[PDB]
Every structure is written in structure tokens, then in C-alpha cells.
């Protein structure tokens, strides 16, 4: 049950490395909208050239969509929000233990478009074709920042825990090999001597019975 | 997708790829048992012979 647990531990230590690799392109793609939205706030740019970095803003959204709705480890998606606190969809358990009830639950909250406000729930992707709006986006950015980082964290801690874990596993693991070969396994020095002992006593045994056997002849003699 | 690619390479080979070290401590573990093994057999089919000596 020990190794079994620590092969589980480096499972859900995959995917949970799975999911920060995941969220590290999202937020790169977060970044840069913020660094769009800071440069269109500018004076000097016209409603066309705003629009073009409105197309560029509305590709970048579609691909943190994508990023959320295609993210998965193991035929599972990850920032759907299935694993998220509230969720009914389902629980993510890791077994860390060799006994019942050893597990210890995960959360991975929804990383959409839409829970992150880059998408309004009409379905209206965030717009910077006007200056004013530039400004508004740019706290919306950095909530989204904050949401990632935040996950981040989480995913990082979750690394941490179950490193220390796997350690503790496959020490207990030798520990306990170790006892139970103590208490199992025979030693071969002193098998061997005590299995000469009884390997020379059976043929002093049997030279004794040969010795015994023609004793009686001896009663031959005055027959 | 090339993050998502080492990702998953590198779980494919924790779930799939062995780890040498203790797979060869295994083997010789294994080896020395089956030495063992085999050379107590060659003294364990000589037990018989003692009996010939009551003939």
C-alpha cells in the first residue's frame, strides 16, 4: 500500500505540474492584453486604430477560451470547473495513504473567459475600441492576474504538500520493509550451522542403527 | 503545446518508464536467491544416499 500511494502521490503530482503549465500560457496571454489596453488608452490613436488592436484583443480571448475549454490530463478537463469548490460535476481525491480514507481532496477553480470578465455573460468579449473603456479594462486585467496568480499559488502549495508527501511515503516504506524482513526473513550464517548440526547428527544416527542392527548376531555363536 | 507536451511526457514516463537502480537490486536479489536455491538442491537430492549404508 506504501509504494502504491507513492506512485499515486507522483500521479497527482503530474497533473497538478499538468495545470500550472496550463495556466502559465493563460496568464503570458493575460499580460499582454493588459499591456494592449495600458497602449490604447493613448490620445493620439483613432477609433480604426483602436479597432485594430480590438481584433488582436478579441484572437487573444478566443485563445484563453480555447486554452480553457481544451485544457485536460488524462481524458479529464482541468479549467472547465468540474474540480471547483461549489461544483456538483465532480471530486478530485488524491490517495496518499496505504489505508482507508487517506486521501486528501483538490480544488481547481473555473479559469472561462467568462469567470475571468474578459466576456460578459451575454457573451460580449471585452471591447477597447474607446479610450475610456481602455481604462475600465485595465482593472478587469489585473482581477483576472489576481485569479491566475491566486491558482497558481494554490497549484504550487499543492506541490510543496505532496512532495513532502511522497518523501515521508518511501521512507515509511523502507522502515517498514526493513521491520518486516527482520521479523520474516531467516539469516543464512546461523541456518547454515544449525542445518550441519542436523546434517551430521543423522549420519552418527545412522552409523548407530547399522552398529545396532548386527548386534544380535552374537547370540549365533553358542547355537 | 509545447509545455502541455514535456507535461505529459513526463507523466507518461513516471506511469510507464522503470526506474534502473532498484529494478537491479531486484535482480540481484533475485539471482542470489535462485544461487541459493540451486545450490542447496545439489546437497538436498543427496540425502538418500545415507540410507544405502543399512545395506
Known amino acids: 500500500g506504501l509504494r502504491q500511494a507513492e506512485r499515486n502521490t507522483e500521479d497527482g503530482m503530474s497533473l497538478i505540474q499538468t495545470t500550472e503549465g496550463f495556466l502559465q500560457e493563460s496568464n503570458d496571454i493575460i499580460q499582454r492584453i493588459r499591456t494592449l489596453a495600458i497602449q490604447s488608452s493613448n490620445g ?65 477553480a473555473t479559469m472561462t ?30 482581477a483576472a492576474l489576481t485569479r491566475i496568480s491566486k491558482q497558481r499559488a494554490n497549484l504550487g502549495a499543492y506541490f510543496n504538500r505532496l512532495e513532502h508527501a511522497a518523501k515521508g511515503l518511501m521512507n515509511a516504506y ?7 524482513s527482520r521479523i520474516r526473513d531467516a539469516d543464512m550464517a546461523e541456518e547454515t550451522v544449525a542445518f550441519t548440526k542436523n546434517q551430521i547428527l543423522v549420519q552418527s544416527g545412522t552409523a548407530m542403527l547399522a552398529q545396532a542392527n548386527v548386534r544380535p548376531q552374537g547370540v549365533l555363536s553358542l547355537l
Open 44 to 108: 493620439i490613436y483613432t477609433e480604426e486604430d483602436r479597432q485594430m488592436i480590438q481584433v488582436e484583443v478579441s484572437q487573444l480571448i478566443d485563445e484563453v477560451d480555447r486554452i480553457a475549454s481544451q485544457a485536460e490530463f488524462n481524458k479529464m478537463n482541468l479549467l472547465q470547473g468540474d474540480f471547483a469548490r461549489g461544483s456538483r460535476a465532480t471530486s478530485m481525491w488524491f490517495h496518499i495513504g496505504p489505508n482507508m480514507h487517506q486521501r486528501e481532496r483538490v480544488f481547481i
Open 113 to 142: 473567459a467568462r469567470s475571468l470578465n474578459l466576456k460578459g455573460q451575454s457573451g460580449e468579449l471585452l471591447s477597447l475600441s474607446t479610450a475610456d473603456k481602455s481604462n475600465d479594462a485595465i482593472g478587469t486585467l489585473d
Open 174 to 180: 523502507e522502515n517498514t520493509q526493513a521491520s518486516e
